[PDB]
Amino acid sequence: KSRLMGLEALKSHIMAAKAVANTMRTSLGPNGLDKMMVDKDGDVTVTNDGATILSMMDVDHQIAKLMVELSKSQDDEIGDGTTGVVVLAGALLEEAEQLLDRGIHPIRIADGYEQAARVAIEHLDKISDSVLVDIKDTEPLIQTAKTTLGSKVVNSCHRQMAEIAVNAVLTVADMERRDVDFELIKVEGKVGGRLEDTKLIKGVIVDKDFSHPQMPKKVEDAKIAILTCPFEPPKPKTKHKLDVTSVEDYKALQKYEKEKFEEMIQQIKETGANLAICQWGFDDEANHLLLQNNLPAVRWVGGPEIELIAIATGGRIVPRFSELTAEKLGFAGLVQEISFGTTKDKMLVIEQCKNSRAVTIFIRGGNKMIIEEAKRSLHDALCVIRNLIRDNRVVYGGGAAEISCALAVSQEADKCPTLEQYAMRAFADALEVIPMALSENSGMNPIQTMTEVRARQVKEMNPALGIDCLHKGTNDMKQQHVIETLIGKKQQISLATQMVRMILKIDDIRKPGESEE
Amino acid sequence: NPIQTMTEVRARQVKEMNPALGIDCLHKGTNDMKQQHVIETLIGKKQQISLATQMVRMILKIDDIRKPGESEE
Amino acid sequence: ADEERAETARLTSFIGAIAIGDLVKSTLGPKGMDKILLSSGRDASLMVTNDGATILKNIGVDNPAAKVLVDMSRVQDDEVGDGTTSVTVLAAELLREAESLIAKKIHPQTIIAGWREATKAAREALLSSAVDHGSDEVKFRQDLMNIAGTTLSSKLLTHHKDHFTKLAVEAVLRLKGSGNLEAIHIIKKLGGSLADSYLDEGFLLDKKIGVNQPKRIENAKILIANTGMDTDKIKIFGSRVRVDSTAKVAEIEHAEKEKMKEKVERILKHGINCFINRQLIYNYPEQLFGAAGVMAIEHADFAGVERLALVTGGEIASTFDHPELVKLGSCKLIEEVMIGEDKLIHFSGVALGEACTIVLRGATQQILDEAERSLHDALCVLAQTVKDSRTVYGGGCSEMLMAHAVTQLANRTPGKEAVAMESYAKALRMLPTIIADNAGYDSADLVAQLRAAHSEGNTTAGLDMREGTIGDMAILGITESFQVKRQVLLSAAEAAEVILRVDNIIKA
Amino acid sequence: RDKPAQIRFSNISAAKAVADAIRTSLGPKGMDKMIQDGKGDVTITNDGATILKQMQVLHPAARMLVELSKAQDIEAGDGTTSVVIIAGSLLDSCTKLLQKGIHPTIISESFQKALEKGIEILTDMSRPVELSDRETLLNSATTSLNSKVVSQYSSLLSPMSVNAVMKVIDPATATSVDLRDIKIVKKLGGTIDDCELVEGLVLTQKVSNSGITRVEKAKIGLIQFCLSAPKTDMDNQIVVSDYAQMDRVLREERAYILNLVKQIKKTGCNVLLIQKSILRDALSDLALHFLNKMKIMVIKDIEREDIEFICKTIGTKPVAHIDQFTADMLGSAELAEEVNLNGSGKLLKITGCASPGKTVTIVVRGSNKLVIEEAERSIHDALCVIRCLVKKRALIAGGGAPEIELALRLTEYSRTLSGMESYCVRAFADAMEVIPSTLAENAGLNPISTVTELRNRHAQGEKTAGINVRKGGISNILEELVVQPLLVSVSALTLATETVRSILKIDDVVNTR
């Protein structure tokens, strides 16, 4: 194989770094123009989302490696911020060429990017120190879910989504805990609904319902019998499923399998519950018996969901039918089979007003692209919202923060006479590329457009108002309500600024060429 | 359109012959030879009839195309 | 992954719908030209296609941008009807419009609202010459009739047009508040009739009567059966395998012939002379069922008695085991109607009721296929003509009016995007242009004049590009429900601005 | 795009290239072909009429001419070339109009104009014939049979042609009396004179031996079952692991069918049409012996059309299983006959069969195949040329001549129409005259003599008269003893007319996914 060093590597790193910053820059923000992306499979994905673009790209290099990696630490915690962290890393790398071309060693600038990465996140700190409680922040949660639902263009009237993300974060992730819960938030949805068909389910919706509507739709508080046990074909994991191969076998199994389920569905109710959640469902034969034995219960519960309805409800674990006991049961504040407004989306909810250990946002949509349109949008909302419901620290987005940063950055950059005097100043120059590439997408000349904000910063020297991010012509950060959590913007940088510098410290690469990923 | 224009005074020949009307060579709204007041000397067109088939016959006349390698000066 | 940057992406955005649009813009518009599908990737074939999807889907759509419209234009056709050829050309128009504006170095975003807002005010100007024709039922008749004949047009239909413009409106004038595809029962076969079709009294069914069965059934009370017999009747003992060797292989066929006989026990219990079921029986079975003396009809169609039960007022049900799990159907006759050489067992309980059977007799399926869609398309445009009885002037006259207004608008409306609105307005008059030379006529004057001419208020007077003439859109009958035209405006305007805003395409 | 423009030209390229050499028509002209095929297959080819259908071409534009070939023949039976060769005349005008700049739709619509104006004149010239009387039936058969294989055997085949249609003849004139009703059954043995037009349903059914269903009250049945037996329909409890186990089930199979064929014999039906549908294989190979043992004609899985001929013509339907005897929906035949001419040949005749005033059956007979052929094809067009008269009566000429008469007189319509199409029809109007020129074209050297005069002569003979390609010389072409029914060319006109505008209806070629 081969070892490429210095300028070779220098042209190995920024090269693969430069192009993917470009696909996202015309994808950048709400005006970022979406990208249809098609697999070898005949697939089609219209993506302005970098992480989705990165999920769409298997493209090959340590950069393309780190890129698919870098955004998705921003996309879960903070959500929105996925796009800027990469494109700006390229812009930083875009600079380091000319800046090493000035004869400043890549590690001579390297600290200067991070050194001046301080002022930006430090300047972000200055923007809005506000932190609001759930019931107060819920408007800023949806006011940010104005923006953080905005980029996917599923936002207004989706204040449903915006509000269901308010409680979904609060329900499981506390405000004081500030340990991220996207794991105990259950992201859920189904095709055939509608974007405006939207709900936050507090407990667990199990997809299948009671074996009949001829038995009540409603199981009361708790009494959920947690069951791994066949009332339909078991398909056990220890042996293999086979069915009856003989004529006398359909005779006896029909007669045998009925009276046991008669006994067992009674034995469930003997052990007791108004709901038996079975990993292995009721058959249609066992359905009429759940009717005949006069018990409500769920037929099908997921193999994992038998843990879910156990944990997510806090319901005390009943492993199986043989472990059935009265004191151990799955729990509910109530149990319903809920039509969501489109009977196509129909679930049996085990709902938690007692303890929700998995809170379920249930989105709906005409199809899957539309619910995912909502969900990743709801995600980034739910993300920033959770960030904000932890600490409501916000910042006016669209770069007017960075336009205010870059000036203060490059100034405070010059203060250290060390060669990063200049190098940190060039760092600030990169802070201006995202609203730039946004102003491109906005239909505006970013050059003049930023200088409007520059002038506005010359006016303000912090973002309050700003330029367009959505394309309107009312140029505001505050009144347009272009606002991001103050956290993730700093996290964008922290993710954006070092990877460059980290790639700066690693130019020594054994490769025949870039494509090794 | 020439094809279109032809079809009209064509249809006119079904209507009318040797007509005081015709196409508009002046690119007018009226297509005539009279409201156009376009004309030639009945000499001229007849004199013009003379020449066309005169070269047609003329490229025929002899059997002799034989040249030094020069049929043009 | 293959990264497609904007240079070819916008370009590929343009080529996809244009390269198919040219094919359908022949078919679409008025008729000076069509698509003759010359078919070989799959076969040796020669086809004549006015259908967009038959042009779209048969040919390789593999362009990721062509994927959009071939997917999106079909739905528009699958929704309101005749949207394949529409959403394709109209966005392909915009692709040309974008291309210049692209080549003019203009933000696609700047082009978005420029078209997208222009889409509205055009749909608004579309709503202007949209003229409600619901006045009387005779108006609503001839509205639907003009509209039914509107979607059928620019397509090859032999005897179809004049009969369904009766039927489609017939299906409408019975349901009153919608049209009936739930009622019209399309029955296709080989009858030797060219396109010739008719409203079928009751519903005919195709079987040869023979063996011992007398062919005609009189005073027939049908016993509705949702479950018949295939060959062996299915119940507890219904299956056996005795085969230990090659003799039993031939001897197992003989064992199941017994199972045909026990089927008689079930039907003889019900007692009704006429037993009509879903599942067919064969001629050797006909021996056992016909000698039983009761008349057991095989393959009696669900939608057929669904016709009856609706019109006869009775109940067609599901899950038939014993006679009363479905309310007994009442027909006047179970008869055999002989159409040419055909023998068709024909159930007549009612005539031309609010559920009709429609017998489609043709020697070719493709015409019967494209006849169904244009019927499937019209009734939808007729069912929305039940809702919106505005029939907006078609044949490009709508394009003109919208092109004139939006141009007038772009003049004042933006300070910049007057680029795209007129560009939008330009794409409007496009669809008119391609077909006038197809009559030989000059679109330029037309789109210049007749637009402004009828956008100065001749709006009824409009484009006959079959004759290449200026004629009345209402009187020529060239016009259609305000929805479908706006509906074919919705997707195509949306179809273009998607790949317009697409500046990169990943390819795995 | 350029592709839309070139492909119609590329269509006009491959298509028009084919339809032209498609005229050597008639004549002893041009050297015979041993055609190595597109796959390398050596084939000796002659007589363009069949060489039409024979032709293997590629591309959409070339095959529509085979499609065009197929069209005229089945329609009339006459003028197989007449429909195609004029597609050479069509695409003449087409390009020149596309070279004139005329629009495809106008060139398309130009096809309909000349067509209407053409069917005008061809009927104007054509001299009406009576399709009821034996006379022009014989005469149109005559000239056709004079252009068919046997001129000598055109004699007896003529009443067998004339009576065949007159069997199926419909009141006065109408387009009817198809060749499907006619069942042409090749009978080995006999001669062409021995070819026999039979009034009733005759079958091509060929079963074992003779005396088999020669009897009286021999009905011809259709059975959509077949007979039973253990190891036929009824069960076997015994299984064969052993040749001895094989024997007792076949013995019990044979013994039971022997009773069933009695029940077919007592049915009055001495021909069952045994379903090609196979139950066990249905009718046993052990059974065929037994049905034939009762003088009942069944060959294993009887030829399906015979099943439909008995359905169509006779009205026979299946019956109950022979175990039940028969419901006797088997149609009414008091005679079904196996005729051996010269003591040879298998022909099932159903006499006394139900026939619906139609299904006349010519039995084309001969000791050779060629003998049957020379008869069979000749009578066919004689059947056709009379079917032609019945369908559309009178007569025009033959060999393309009267089309030049149309061509002269159509240019006059091309004079009147006063449109672009008046020129377009005109660009086509005289493009018709290429046929007799190209008919006489292919035989030789020092070429140019007769060709323009093959056109010029007719216009000299003016509007009534022209040269007769078959007998030579100028006259009224419609009767030199040169005729085809007025149907044949007006049938030839529209088809090629139709098919060519499709090329213009082509915006651009494609290829399916």
- Joined together, the tokens standing for residue D438 give 């190209």
| Separation CA C428–CA C406 (nearest Å) | 10
Please, what is the end-to-end C-alpha distance for chain B in angstroms? 40
| Separation CA A108–CA D482 (nearest Å) | 105
Please, what is the end-to-end C-alpha distance for chain C in angstroms? 4
- Does residue C488 contact residue C90 with C-beta atoms inside 8 Å? yes
Evaluated on CA atoms D201, D202, D208, D212, the torsion sign reads positive
- Does residue D397 contact residue D483 with C-beta atoms inside 8 Å? yes
CA distances from D229 to C241, C261, D285, D296 (A): 21, 18, 12, 18
Q: From the CA of D425, how many Å to the nearest CA of chain B?
A: 13
- Joined together, the tokens standing for residue A454 give 């520059």
| Separation CA D226–CA D233 (nearest Å) | 8
| Separation CA C384–CA C82 (nearest Å) | 14
Q: From the CA of D413, how many Å to the nearest CA of chain B?
A: 12
Sequential DSSP letters for D291-357? HHHTT----SS--HHHHHHIIIII-----S-GGG-----S---SEEEE--BTTB---EEEES----S
Annotated binding residues of A for ADP, written as ranges, equal 29, 81-83, 151, 398, 468, 484, 489
Q: Tokens 């875009």 label which residue?
A: A94
| Separation CA C367–CA C164 (nearest Å) | 14
Residue of D nearest to B16 (CA): D418
| Separation CA D321–CA D300 (nearest Å) | 17
Residue of C nearest to A43 (CA): C64
| Separation CA C473–CA C479 (nearest Å) | 6
- Does residue C205 contact residue C345 with C-beta atoms inside 8 Å? yes
Are D420 and B3 a contacting pair at CB < 8 A? yes
Sequential DSSP letters for D142-188? HHHHHHSS-SSTHHHHHHHHHHHHHHH--SSS-S---TTTS--EEEE
Query: Quick one: which of D169, D79, D101 has its CA closest to D133?
Result: D169
Pick the catalytic residue: C34, C200, C377, C472? C377
Q: Is D30 on the interface with B (CB under 8 A)?
A: no
Could you give the angle at the alpha carbon of C471 between the alpha carbons of D424 and C49, nearest 5°?
A: 60
- Joined together, the tokens standing for residue C249 give 């292989």
Using an 8 Å CB-CB cutoff, list chain B residues near D422: 7, 10
| Separation CA D32–CA D255 (nearest Å) | 62
- Joined together, the tokens standing for residue C257 give 């012939």
- Does residue A336 contact residue A218 with C-beta atoms inside 8 Å? yes
Q: Which amino acid is at A7?
A: L
Could you give the angle at the alpha carbon of D19 between the alpha carbons of D13 and D23, nearest 5°?
A: 140
- Does residue C238 contact residue C259 with C-beta atoms inside 8 Å? yes
Are C107 and A46 a contacting pair at CB < 8 A? no
- Does residue C16 contact residue C8 with C-beta atoms inside 8 Å? no
Residue of C nearest to D315 (CA): C210
Residue of A nearest to C13 (CA): A36
Q: Is D101 on the interface with B (CB under 8 A)?
A: yes
Q: DSSP assignment, residue D324?
A: G
For residue C472, what are the β-bridge partners?
A: C461
| Separation CA A486–CA A128 (nearest Å) | 7
Q: Is A57 on the interface with C (CB under 8 A)?
A: yes
Query: Quick one: which of A429, A486, A329 has its CA closest to A92?
Result: A429
- Does residue D37 contact residue D455 with C-beta atoms inside 8 Å? no
Q: Is A41 on the interface with C (CB under 8 A)?
A: yes
Q: Is D228 on the interface with B (CB under 8 A)?
A: no
| Separation CA A410–CA A401 (nearest Å) | 14
Are C247 and D67 a contacting pair at CB < 8 A? no
DSSP strand pairing (D348-351 vs C203-206)? unpaired
Interface test with B, best of D113, D413, D418, D425 (most B CBs within 10 A): D418
Query: What 3-state DSSP class applies to D294?
Result: coil
Q: Which chains does chain B touch, 3 or more C-beta pairs < 8 A? A: D
Residue D130 CA from chain centroid, whole number: 23
Are C211 and D327 a contacting pair at CB < 8 A? yes
The H or E element containing residue A286 is: helix A284-292
Rounded to 5 degrees, φ, ψ at A356 are -95, 105
Q: Which amino acid is at D40?
A: G
Residue of A nearest to C65 (CA): A36
- Does residue A285 contact residue A261 with C-beta atoms inside 8 Å? yes
Q: Is B17 exposed, middle or buried (0-12, 13-18, 19+ CB in 10 A)?
A: exposed
Rounded to 5 degrees, φ, ψ at C238 are -65, -10
Query: What 3-state DSSP class applies to C297?
Result: strand
Pick the catalytic residue: A47, A49, A283, A313? A49
Q: Tokens 């079952």 label which residue?
A: D225
Q: Is D148 exposed, middle or buried (0-12, 13-18, 19+ CB in 10 A)?
A: buried
Q: Is A256 exposed, middle or buried (0-12, 13-18, 19+ CB in 10 A)?
A: exposed
| Separation CA C146–CA C139 (nearest Å) | 10
| Separation CA D379–CA D381 (nearest Å) | 6
Tell me the angle at which helices C160-175 and C137-152 cross, rounded to the nearest 10 degrees. Answer: 140
- Does residue C260 contact residue C231 with C-beta atoms inside 8 Å? yes
- Does residue A196 contact residue A276 with C-beta atoms inside 8 Å? no
Q: Is C321 exposed, middle or buried (0-12, 13-18, 19+ CB in 10 A)?
A: exposed
Could you give the angle at the alpha carbon of D108 between the alpha carbons of D105 and D113, nearest 5°?
A: 120
Strand order of the β-sheet with A359-365 is: A185-191, A359-365, A198-201
D to C contact (≥3 Cβ pairs closer than 8 Å): yes
The H or E element containing residue A38 is: none
Strand order of the β-sheet with C203-206 is: C203-206, C344-348, C333-337, C217-218
Q: DSSP assignment, residue D126?
A: P
Residue A166 CA from chain centroid, whole number: 14
Counting Cα atoms < 13 Å in the Cβ hemisphere of D176 gives 13
- Does residue D88 contact residue D62 with C-beta atoms inside 8 Å? no
Buried b (16+ CB within 10 A) or exposed e, C255-274: bebebbeebbebbeebebbb
- Does residue C342 contact residue C303 with C-beta atoms inside 8 Å? no
Q: Over A307-361, what HEC string results?
A: HHHHHCCCCCCCCCCCCCCCCCCECCCEEEEEECCCCCCEEEEEECCCCCCCEEE
Query: Quick one: which of A25, A50, A21 has its CA closest to A37?
Result: A50
Number of DSSP helices (H) and strands (E) in chain B, helices first? 2, 0
CB neighbour list of residue D426: distance below 8 Å, 6 or more residues apart: D411, D414, D415
- Joined together, the tokens standing for residue D413 give 């319509």
Evaluated on CA atoms D494, D498, D500, D501, the torsion sign reads positive
Evaluated on CA atoms D257, D263, D266, D271, the torsion sign reads negative
- Joined together, the tokens standing for residue A377 give 């949008």
Residue C84 a catalytic site member: yes
Q: DSSP assignment, residue A448?
A: H
Q: Which amino acid is at A202?
A: K
Torsion of the alpha carbons at C426, C430, C431 and C435, rounded to the nearest 10: 160
Please state how this structure was obtained: cryo-EM
| Separation CA C430–CA C25 (nearest Å) | 10
Sequential DSSP letters for A359-385? EEEEEEESSHHHHHHHHHHHHHHHHHH
Please, what is the end-to-end C-alpha distance for chain A in angstroms? 15
Q: DSSP assignment, residue D310?
A: I
Number of DSSP helices (H) and strands (E) in chain D, helices first? 16, 12
Number of DSSP helices (H) and strands (E) in chain C, helices first? 16, 17
Q: Which amino acid is at C107?
A: H
3-state helix, strand, coil in chain B (%, to 5): 40, 0, 60
Active site residues of D: 47, 80-81, 381
Using an 8 Å CB-CB cutoff, list chain A residues near C1: 56-59
Q: Which chains does chain A touch, 3 or more C-beta pairs < 8 A? A: C
Partner residue facing D279 (CB), from C37, C253, C439: C253
Strand order of the β-sheet with D360-366 is: D185-188, D360-366, D196-199
Partner residue facing A443 (CB), from C1, C109, C502: C109
The CA radius of gyration of chain A, in Å to the nearest whole number, is 28
DSSP strand pairing (A275-278 vs A224-227)? parallel
Residues 16-55 of B with CB under 8 A from D: none
| Separation CA D338–CA D185 (nearest Å) | 13
Q: From the CA of D423, how many Å to the nearest CA of chain B?
A: 9
Residue A414 a catalytic site member: no
- Does residue C64 contact residue C12 with C-beta atoms inside 8 Å? yes
Tell me the angle at which helices A62-76 and A368-390 cross, rounded to the nearest 10 degrees. Answer: 70
Query: What 3-state DSSP class applies to A151?
Result: coil
Could you give the angle at the alpha carbon of A303 between the alpha carbons of A300 and A305, nearest 5°?
A: 75
Using an 8 Å CB-CB cutoff, list chain A residues near C109: 31, 33, 441-443, 471
Using an 8 Å CB-CB cutoff, list chain C residues near D508: 22-23
Query: Quick one: which of C175, C34, C79 has its CA closest to C376?
Result: C79
Q: Is A442 on the interface with C (CB under 8 A)?
A: yes
- Joined together, the tokens standing for residue A268 give 């469930």
- Does residue A413 contact residue A436 with C-beta atoms inside 8 Å? no
- Joined together, the tokens standing for residue B12 give 């006119």
Query: What 3-state DSSP class applies to D89?
Result: helix
Query: Quick one: which of A53, A47, C25 has its CA closest to D508?
Result: C25
- Does residue A62 contact residue A17 with C-beta atoms inside 8 Å? no
Please, what is the end-to-end C-alpha distance for chain D in angstroms? 21
- Joined together, the tokens standing for residue D250 give 């076949």
Q: Is C218 exposed, middle or buried (0-12, 13-18, 19+ CB in 10 A)?
A: exposed
Q: Over A484-512, what HEC string results?
A: EEHHHHHHHHHHHHHHHHHHHHCCCEECC
- Joined together, the tokens standing for residue C42 give 């799959």
For residue A395, what are the β-bridge partners?
A: A484
Q: Is A517 on the interface with C (CB under 8 A)?
A: no
Tell me the angle at which helices A446-460 and A400-415 cross, rounded to the nearest 10 degrees. Answer: 70
| Separation CA A10–CA A507 (nearest Å) | 7
Residue of C nearest to A246 (CA): C240
The CA radius of gyration of chain B, in Å to the nearest whole number, is 19
The CA radius of gyration of chain D, in Å to the nearest whole number, is 28
